[PDB]
Design a binder for these strands. Structure first.
Lengths: 51, 117, 150, 55
RNA sequence: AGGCGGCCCCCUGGACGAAGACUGACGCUCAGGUGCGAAAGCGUGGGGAGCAAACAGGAUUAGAUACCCUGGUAGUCCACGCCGUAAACGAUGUCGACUUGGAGGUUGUGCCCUUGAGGCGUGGCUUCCGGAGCUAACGCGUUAAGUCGACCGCCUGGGGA
RNA sequence: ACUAUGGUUUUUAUU
């Protein structure tokens, strides 16, 4: 990726590249690893903004 | 009419055009130019080159107004919003700084919908 | 490694103090005979009185001023995103990129008179237009290609 | 959904230009935003908040 | 169902939480019949900015009536009626009672000194993954392409039709 | 996302 910018910022957020596909796919989706770490531990992670 | 050799440059870059206005702190807009007035069309009109030559043609339109230093204020989400420093260097101008003046992203029609997360 | 270049870097002329002359005595002069090549070496300044160029003591400095490239286009292929980006040429290499030109219709001309022939091209290449600049106006064409990104 | 007359809360979601601030930059949820916009619309019709700065 | 998004006020078919009391098989399907448009077509009078078949042109090209571009009618819009169209595709007739796990969203409800765009159970809807069974294959997968029970519509090599 | 062209359209082969 690619994809054209629509909100101007001079510094990147590392939000869309290599984090994001390489790695980011087919390793967390649907019950992979599970136990508590990809869902329940994050439901117990406090946030001062939504999330 | 203040003769301070000093002024402000206001840029606005869109997904087709780019606007460049040069103004005095007394509110006198000394000259203005666009990538559209430079004869360009479509995606080429939106380029950092098309913005830079619009600024070089505007620096060529203030060349009897007695000014030597500019402070830059950049606006708009398009490409070509910060190439004006290369136009100042082409015209022999001095620069203070480049400040982003982005207003709050109201409305928010058709952002790129590809992916997410 | 092998480098495939002589990387010269020479000494200036021993009676003019100039480095430009010590490189331009090498044009249209063959097999290094520079002390018996009296029919060509320096003689373009003596035949300019029969050709349209002006001020013979600077006629090579002004000709070179009007033909040199400023950029080179260099791809950065990643996917792509081919990045046909221009970058500026360095302060010695800007002259080496012009070494092969200016003789391309003089070698290759007939009618003898090598010194008068070089003074003809020394007048024609100095126009910043048409001849000697056909590849300079091709770099200008290749500099249009990065504008495709938008 | 409950109030439109006490404007102290509604001024927290509009600019000095009277334009509505997106939920994605206030830490606010969208199912709130959808009704905070209704509270702002109610308070515009009450003439106690501005519609547009034209005006 | 086709489809349905600015605020504000009435009226309205279904779905669901929940404590009491009352019917007492009142249930289901359906030939014929009858109800209803995303669209364009019928047409009288209004409307005309987006977009646009038709259409004047620009072209294009070897050519063009087309791609591309300037302008633009029918039509989309309004009152009132006819037409009943489509891939009308949720690929799954309408009804009855069963089967097997996980995870999200959305809406009640019990309890949280609410890590809480909620949590952990329990009712409704629904989406992705997945098991029995069924399938040539896609897979369907409790809202099934499964299990058969009611009733209807329709069928028996391809083209011709 | 990273730079325009559009037509002609094999016959015997296999005994």
């Amino acid at each position: 990726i690619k994809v054209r910018e629509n909100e101007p910022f001079d510094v990147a957020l590392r939000r869309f590249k290599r984090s994001c596909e390489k790695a980011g796919v087919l390793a967390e989706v649907r019950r992979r690893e599970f136990y508590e770490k990809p869902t329940t531990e994050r439901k117990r992670a406090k946030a001062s903004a939504v999330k | 009419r203040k003769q301070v050799s000093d002024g402000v440059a206001h840029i606005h870059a869109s997904f087709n055009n780019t606007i460049v206005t040069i103004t005095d702190r007394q509110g006198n807009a000394l000259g203005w130019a666009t990538a559209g007035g430079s004869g360009f069309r479509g995606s080429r009109k939106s380029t950092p080159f098309a913005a830079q030559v619009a600024a070089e043609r505007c620096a060529d339109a203030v060349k009897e107004y007695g000014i030597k230093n500019l402070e830059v204020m950049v606006k708009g989400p398009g490409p070509g919003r910060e190439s004006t420093i290369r136009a100042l260097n082409a015209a022999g101008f001095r620069i203070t700084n480049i400040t982003d003046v982005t207003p709050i992203p109201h409305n928010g029609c058709r952002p790129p919908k590809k992916r997410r997360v | 490694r092998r480098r495939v270049i002589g990387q010269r870097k020479i000494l200036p002329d021993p009676k003019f103090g100039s480095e430009l002359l010590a490189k331009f005595v090498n044009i249209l002069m063959v097999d290094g005979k520079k002390s018996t090549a009296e029919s060509i070496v320096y003689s373009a300044l003596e035949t300019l009185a029969q050709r349209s160029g002006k001020s013979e003591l600077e006629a090579f400095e002004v000709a070179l001023e009007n033909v040199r490239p400023t950029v080179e286009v260099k791809s950065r292929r990643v996917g792509g995103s081919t990045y046909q980006v221009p970058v500026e040429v360095r302060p010695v290499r800007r002259n080496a990129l012009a070494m092969r030109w200016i003789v391309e219709a003089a070698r290759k001309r007939g009618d003898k008179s090598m010194a008068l022939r070089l003074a003809n091209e020394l007048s024609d290449a100095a126009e910043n237009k048409g001849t000697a600049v056909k590849k300079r106006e091709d770099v200008h064409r290749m500099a249009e290609a990065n504008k495709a990104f938008a | 959904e409950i109030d439109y007359k006490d404007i102290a809360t509604l001024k927290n979601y509009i600019t000095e230009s009277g334009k509505i601030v997106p939920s994605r930059i206030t830490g606010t949820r969208a199912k709130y935003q959808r009704q905070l916009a209704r509270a702002i619309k109610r308070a515009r019709y009450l003439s106690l908040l501005p519609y547009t700065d034209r005006h």
